[model samples]
Target: PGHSLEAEREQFDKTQAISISKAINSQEAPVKEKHARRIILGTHHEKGAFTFWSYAIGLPLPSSSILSWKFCHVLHKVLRDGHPNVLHDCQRYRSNIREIGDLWGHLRDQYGHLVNIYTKLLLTKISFHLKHPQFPAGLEVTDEVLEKAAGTDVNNIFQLTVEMFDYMDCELKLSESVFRQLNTAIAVSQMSSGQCRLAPLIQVIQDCSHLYHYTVKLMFKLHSCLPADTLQGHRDRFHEQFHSLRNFFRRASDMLYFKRLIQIPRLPEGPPNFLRASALAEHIKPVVVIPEE
Candidate 1:
């Protein structure tokens, strides 16, 4: 058995190389979970995504936009479903992540803005989940779970809403930036570049759904506990995002691209009315229905 130690090490290296390369995806198609499954499993067995990050960090990301786009997409799945330590594993390479975004930030529309915004969205998601942690993976934090995260201090709710906006802000900005670039003149499906950017919005809708849900939940929570006039500033910002977020989601709903990718839930016909105590329940939940790919 001892004689096989060298053989075992070689096997392990081969497995790493295969899993990392396959999962990162070299093209524009949505990454299959089958391809990424081994990498996700690898993170659990090793307690981190050590091999994946090292391999990704070394890729010539500057040369290809689609390659970088797919890398971000795969990393997202890894973060959402992989080992918890993978977040820390990811943060350790934060600067590496930002540099790719920064590189694409200065480039053309070939998924460049989406990549830039996606990196920011990813890093922000990483940092938020790391600090609060209970938001949990899969963007699936239940309502009961959310109430508990908001259960503590009124002051914390104040702080919580503020931090929540930044998360929402980045998501909204990505959505806005994206919709701005996609005009009515062309068939969006023709370009892999367009598809690459468009795919990320499926995740965005899920994330946005929860962000709006809790922001309203807490806003309702806070209004009862504090003076109304003090919250106007917050409410003002909420309305601004509300209109824009709703508009962005509406635009996406009409697109043939998203219709195939997801069943995006609608925000309630209106935002929550903090002035009235009864409107809380009137707020419709945005539960995204994703088709299995």
Candidate 2:
């Protein structure tokens, strides 16, 4: 009530330990939006995810399925947009990340199952970005930077593309598992058993979008240096994901749930022609946009 102005708004005290513990507890329900948004602010305001992870590491991951599921969500946000040091800082808890992931992965519950795949995916991304160290935490790589990241060497181009394919498969498995777990019987508009997973899918779109562009860029780069036959496997795998990714975009775009929340891009009728760099003239990059929070 004191000050609602911008200058006064800079006052972001460190997020309380009790607060994070309270919000991300051993409960069945998804973490509410109120605390979820502020949780991210804790990192941005405090200058790192140090405080956030400190409390999160001890979470009773096996005791609560939904908590573990949503923990992945908040951690995803913090990793993407929280702070730069978070990428490095995350190394300390990397093993625990896998520990909880393997535990949940073997349990065979629905959300628990999905949680494992996502955790594994995070491990992949965290390890890769740490190894590369050039891409930002939010995980967007522009053109000039992409060239630098994938250097001029032929072998470098080959290995990077293959690593991307590995990532692409990891991405596809997470998506397929989510899709497989979600049955078509529930309502999208009303709160129901199938409903809570909606916000989670929005995060999928983030991965799907960047994954789409990065692969396309890498495929084009690889084709320039490597032979086409060597990459036939790549094309087959890329096409496998292209259809799935396109289905994801089109399916979400039609519903009121996502329509009001974000702008999904139009995927070209076919995968971009990788053989010819000139085809990029007509090949549009698939860029999904989320509203500014």
Candidate 3:
């Protein structure tokens, strides 16, 4: 007789199974094990989603000047490899530190109010840092914990969406009218306290602020480095972050408009089918994919 196993929508039934699942998710699992493979797939999918949204909002935009693989590689290094970048330095920047807050105020004054999409892009970058970046505190928020929390929160997806729109609306309010369009932006951002789906988005935004502070300290280290071709390369790398963002917007410009407001009441005007037909037509445009060449 041969042993067999069955897999389903979830990994296991309950209790000890949960503990065993956690053990599997942990670094304790062998690198080549089934558990390790699952972990890799989950992280990669989450990261891909995170990266897509990050680019959509514009934190550090992709750069044509740099290799696409290297772009992701650098992010993985800073966020995952513990190579001493922004994530490691977040504690020193907590709100408890007044001097750090002052430094943040300065940076905010300089780049914070920029009307371009960079503001949102920065927030998206921070999201990646908090959830993926190896903060000592964030790291303590292990995969098992996220798994448990995920299981506990049945409405987590809705909560995240609501939170995302509100934060986006608030951030947009903090800036001037984007692209000379205020009404569309305002309508897109409209949300109410009764709408509870936005909590996860708020959590993500707070994480962005936390990661932003971490990046500030990294900037000081970058500035203090000695001159060399390596230094030039570093500057280019940072510039690529900005350049990639502009390219992303150029590609996505038409699709963006009050996207934060996908749900709301409108004064009874056009038939609902008009909206559906428009949406159906919009779907005809093919999604853009960066060439592998």
Task: Compare the candidates by TM-score and give the number of the best one.
Answer: 1
Ranking by lDDT: 1, 2, 3
C-alpha RMSD for every candidate = 2.7, 4.3, 21.9
Which pairs of residues clash in candidate 2, taking residues 3 or more apart in a chain or in different chains? none
Clashes of each: 0, 0, 10
From the highest TM-score down, the ranking of the candidates is 1, 2, 3
Q: Give the 10-residue window scoring lowest on summed lDDT in candidate 1.
A: 185-194
Off by over 4 Å in 1: 2-16, 23-33, 185-191
Please, what are the lDDT tens digits per residue for candidate 3 over residues 79-175? 3323233442423322222222233334433222221233343344455446533333222244454444334332552343234333334333332
lDDT of each: 0.79, 0.72, 0.30
Candidate 1: residue 227 lDDT (0-100): 92
- TM-score of candidate 2 on Cα atoms, chains taken together: 0.86
User: Which portions of model 2 miss their true places by more than 4 Å?
Assistant: 1-14, 26-30, 185-187
Two-way lDDT contest, 1 vs 2, winner = 1
lDDT (tens digit, per residue) of candidate 1 on 1-293: 68799998777667877866775655766665576777788788888888777677778778777778778887777887788888888888999889999999887755776789889988888888887888865557888888888886898788889988898998888878777777774234646556666766777788788888889899998898999998899999899889988887788887777766688777655567899989887777777787876
Candidate 2's residue-wise lDDT over 1-293, tens digit each? Answer: 55666544444433446566656765655556667778666766667777777667768788877778777767776677767777777878898778878988777688788888888877887887787787775667777887798788878777777777676667667767766755554225544334455666676677667768777877887788778888898888888888977877776676555656678788887898888889766766677688765
Judged by TM-score relative to the true structure, which candidate is superior, 2 or 3?
A: 2
Q: Could you tell me which 10 consecutive residues in candidate 3 have the lowest summed lDDT? A: 263-272
